[PDB]
Amino acid sequence: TGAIEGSNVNAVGEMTALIDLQRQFEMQVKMMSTAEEMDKSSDSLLRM
Amino acid sequence: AISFDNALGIHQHTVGVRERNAEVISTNIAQANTPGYKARGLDFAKELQAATSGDKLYRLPTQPDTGDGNTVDLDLERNLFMQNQIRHQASLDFLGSKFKNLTKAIKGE
């Protein structure tokens, strides 16, 4: 009694999770870009 | 002898089958993005036999679908369409030369 319990959020734990989520997000975006790049190249097969 | 069948050979039935195959291949390409659509294959040997005198084949996917259910491998469809067009062009040349040779003999020109 006479005290209030705050939150247990570990600020560093969230920040290091953020930077890893950013890098993994960006790497998958590159996978999307190289997927359409391959698709565009494999379109001259029907380009007689 | 001296008949159009014995003269043209199987180059008249083959052309029809090659156009049939192109219709099937083009259908798979168009229906690539439709979920639940299963890729359709065509047996050339059976179709040629049926054409000479006169069932559904599905293509096994190389990899699982991403959830939609469509088993159309657009990389393979383009390759087969390119091959079908080349062999169809040869069949037209083969069949076209049958008529030219027949006309050449009946006129001596």
Side-chain angles (χ1 to χ4, degrees):
Chain A
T1 176
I4 269 187
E5 177 178 0
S7 180
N8 55 8
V9 171
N10 187 28
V12 177
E14 315 302 325
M15 288 304 174
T16 182
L18 257 55
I19 65 182
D20 179 60
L21 287 178
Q22 297 183 42
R23 303 301 164 259
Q24 187 173 2
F25 178 86
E26 293 175 347
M27 294 166 194
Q28 294 164 144
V29 155
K30 304 178 65 58
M31 178 56 63
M32 294 178 59
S33 66
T34 191
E36 64 166 340
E37 182 180 356
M38 287 170 48
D39 187 68
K40 290 205 294 292
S41 66
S42 65
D43 210 358
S44 59
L45 298 175
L46 306 182
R47 208 187 300 265
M48 290 179 50
Chain B
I2 311 186
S3 302
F4 272 119
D5 306 7
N6 282 354
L8 271 19
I10 68 175
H11 305 291
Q12 48 174 341
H13 306 289
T14 307
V15 168
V17 179
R18 296 284 159 77
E19 288 187 350
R20 282 196 53 179
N21 192 27
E23 293 181 0
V24 175
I25 299 298
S26 67
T27 304
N28 298 336
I29 299 180
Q31 303 282 357
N33 293 263
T34 306
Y37 181 86
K38 301 305 177 182
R40 268 271 298 175
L42 197 73
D43 196 343
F44 177 81
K46 287 182 175 298
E47 282 293 336
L48 186 56
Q49 168 60 239
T52 315
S53 58
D55 190 6
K56 293 182 178 180
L57 292 183
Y58 295 91
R59 199 162 299 162
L60 296 178
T62 311
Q63 302 176 62
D65 45 293
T66 45
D68 50 72
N70 201 327
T71 59
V72 166
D73 185 10
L74 207 57
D75 313 334
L76 175 61
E77 305 292 340
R78 300 196 190 99
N79 187 265
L80 296 180
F81 196 92
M82 173 189 60
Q83 296 185 202
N84 179 84
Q85 187 173 354
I86 302 177
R87 309 185 81 94
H88 176 245
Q89 179 176 352
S91 299
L92 293 178
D93 206 334
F94 296 161
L95 182 59
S97 182
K98 293 298 181 180
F99 293 108
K100 292 192 298 181
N101 286 261
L102 258 60
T103 299
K104 180 177 186 63
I106 66 186
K107 307 183 68 174
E109 59 187 12

